Amino acid sequence: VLVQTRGGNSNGALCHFPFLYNNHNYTDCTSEGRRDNMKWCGTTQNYDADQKFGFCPMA
Numbered sequence: 001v002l003v004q005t006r007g008g009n010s011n012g013a014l015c016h017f018p019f020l021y022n023n024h025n026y027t028d029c030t031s032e033g034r035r036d037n038m039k040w041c042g043t044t045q046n047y048d049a050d051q052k053f054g055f056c057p058m059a
């Protein structure tokens, strides 16, 4: 699969996995920070120390 994003805090980067999100190593996309339904993903390897996310346009 290929999760690429463009607009989040990555200024145009490909989401990566696994990605620590608030001490929550997520090896995929998650909608815990959304209130609609889609799912986003971190673009860094340490969200707790990076603060960079993106979207997960995929299935």
Ligand SMILES: *[C@@H]1O[C@H](CO)[C@@H](O)[C@H](O)[C@H]1NC(C)=O
Pocket (backbone or CB within 6 Å): 020, 023, 024, 025
């Ligand atoms: C998440 O993975 C990183 C890389 O191995 C590790 O340093 C960190 O402690 C892990 N955190 C959790 C909650 O598993």
